[model samples]
Target chain A: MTALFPYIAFENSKEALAYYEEVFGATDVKRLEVGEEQASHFGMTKEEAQEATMHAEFEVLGVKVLCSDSFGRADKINNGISLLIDYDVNNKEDADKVEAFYEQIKDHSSIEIELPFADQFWGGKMGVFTDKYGVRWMLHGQDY
Target chain B: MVFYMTALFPYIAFENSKEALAYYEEVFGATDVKRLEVGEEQASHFGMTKEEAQEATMHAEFEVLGVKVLCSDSFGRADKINNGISLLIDYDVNNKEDADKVEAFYEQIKDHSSIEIELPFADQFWGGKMGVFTDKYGVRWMLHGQDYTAIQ
Candidate 1:
């Protein structure tokens, strides 16, 4: 079986890279610029290559997030897929980040049904939200 | 941001769980598929019609490539698949040629969805070939190649 990484599409993946850097406090953002040679190798014309994102991956609080631009290929953002972001409760700052994460993208989404993180029926400190990009995101866990 | 769930899970929902499970096996080479259909408990607890309960895919776990994916067909939720979110598969071949095995992917999804070649895998920028595409099943994939240690 292949390891599945959560890959998100952005209208402008280049812009989203910086946007998430601020949101997730990302580190080690490795970028591979699509050059003329790179474009030619990928069968892209020089003009299109200039606008392509060869690679945009980074670590957010230690988790690897992969991203790329649609460049008009994807149909639409669908459900059935979500990234489960888990953190410990004792890490108040981590807990706080969960709230901030929900807050920032909640308004931009079509679905918003996040209850308080105190609910424990399902498990310790859990909530789900769909971002504007239609990515279902979950943050759940308790302290170590 | 901070994820410690160990191996990650990509939970997929299908309107028709049993059929979709087989379709995945056919289209995506999903193997070792384990299924748990909605039983009396799940139906009553979830307020599902008997037919709905039976039709719904209660739980299905399968391994595609070398990764595991969990799927289900719940009775209540509507099917809401779009194109923005995607599951990326990293071929992650180190010093390995042909990170891509085009025949399997192409033969399976010749007319699946909006098929296009986003990137070609021949001497890519990161010193390895890479291929990117979205399949007919509405999932995004990347045939990736990179050696982190070599870069380090």
Candidate 2:
């Protein structure tokens, strides 16, 4: 079973998924629109329910990102939590390789906060950054 | 490539996404990044509600400098959000001087009145000082220092 996941909300979930597909070279993106039955099940009007993007799935850099339009009124978006990306690295050489990957995409992006890659209490080396597109990302290297 | 993007939380639709966008822009000085509105015909074909078609921000992007945010009005039901999640801000700092600067940033919005979690930043287990508070509008937040030396 998958242990961790990142769920995102977008005003235009369809467009957001498409944009990421272009940027990350995503593959196998699938979208589902809310049907009349599904909307009625949720107590939404036929029109409102139909508007909901039931589900969208895709993969970028080998990671899965799932998205959907709000079924009801949209709530305030918050950055309280970020999706953590964990990788496996063995030594300094591996660490540098991971850092280099981050460096390549670091520019043209806003840095919410920056920290050195270090060991975490959870037994991994980790760092955090928000991409130029405003999506918050956490990177971790696990030593096995 | 197993890409999956889930709603961080469900969106709450307003009468007009544009109107709500304007409110946020005025209050937060948010910079408009991008916007897309679906046409009525497209909405009908897709089975979108009239209200959803008229009000939904097909796509709306905004930013508060280094931070980027986005949202759209729901064509569905809006529900209550529990305080289970919050946006975390980790300030990059090296010394006490930098810490003070970070503190000042927090001070600017301390009196927002709608804040839910208000308190001074303190040290955390991951090896940095931090604090948690909400904005004037009930949005939650976390402020932390950029220190990871002893995190392991």
Candidate 3:
């Protein structure tokens, strides 16, 4: 209720946490793996339960992203919901890394738009790209 | 007012943003929305091909349920739509008028959905009434806090 953190469900969350770390400069601060003990309760086979992710959290810049495996096959990642990194470009370091964030995921995903880094009518620089997992991203700044 | 609404505005990337925004205005009473189109200048600056930018939504922001619902016209195909993320709305129990609002919100979108209720708006063990559904638009919606307390 206080914060609107983006919660994403992944069939392969272990892989996703790593992807987030590599692509978004996110750190996997916390993660949970399904164990043999908790297998049957989730209606998962022993092997399936081991593969299931109970929960995972990552920190990208200042934002926290939540991830996990779904209750069923019907829950998978999609392109409809995307995240916007409206960066606080108050300095050169922040401004420089803005596009670095863009470049990191550009080739790995189907880029909707190349990093334009253009001035917006409202102010700040932003560009959109969809990651390999079909997660869209918007990198915002002033001089990217 | 929600503090995070300013920090993280949920942006729904659907094929029909203009239509979606209008539908939201009708459904959620989102009256103030600014829609921008990607014209020639935008196409050039955005580093997008003309075909990709033309008639595409540059950006759009609207207020719904007291939060900013940012959006854009989809450049990707319909297959990209998924249940990866959902917009969670809290029908805050700050006043008595909140209960009917939740049912009304639920009624409007349910008709346009596959009838997928991940969780019904009933009294949860943790308290409050909550529900989730993936609309026909392929976007997920959630009402996290609606209760009898909000009415009394």
- Superposed on all Cα atoms, the candidates' RMSDs to the truth, in angstroms, are 5.8, 18.5, 6.3
DockQ leaderboard ranking = 1, 3, 2
Full ranking by TM-score: 3, 1, 2
- Mark the regions of model 1 whose C-alpha exceeds 4 Å error after superposition: A33-52, A86-115, A142-144, B1-7, B74-80, B95-127, B131-136, B147-152
Each model's lDDT: 0.64, 0.55, 0.67
Best by lDDT: 3
How close to the true structure is residue A118 of candidate 1, measured as C-alpha lDDT?
52
TM-score to native of every candidate shown: 0.67, 0.40, 0.69
Candidate 3 docking class:
acceptable
TM-score per model (chain B): 0.69, 0.59, 0.68
User: Mind giving the per-residue lDDT tens digits that candidate 1 earns over B1-152?
Assistant: 45444234677776677887887787777889999878866788877877877776766887776667777774447345555666666664553432444335545655555455566434566575456665555555666555555765
What i-RMS does each candidate reach, in Å?
Answer: 4.3, 12.5, 4.7
- lDDT tens readout by residue for model 3, B52-129: 665578579887556677788766643456777766666655555665666676776566434567777666774676
Model 2 residue A1 lDDT? 12
Which lDDT tens digits does candidate 3 get at residues A1-144?
323456687768878787777767786468888888788776678887766788778877566777677666545666567777665566555556665765675655434564554667877777766677777666666432
Q: Deviation in angstroms for A19 in model 3?
A: 2.5
**Share of native C-alpha contacts between chains A and B (below 8 angstroms) recovered by candidate 1:** 0.58
lDDT of 2 by residue, A1-144 (tens): 101224455566676676766544567898887788887677778877655677677765455666667544435334333445545565554456566656655553344545555677868676766554345566657666
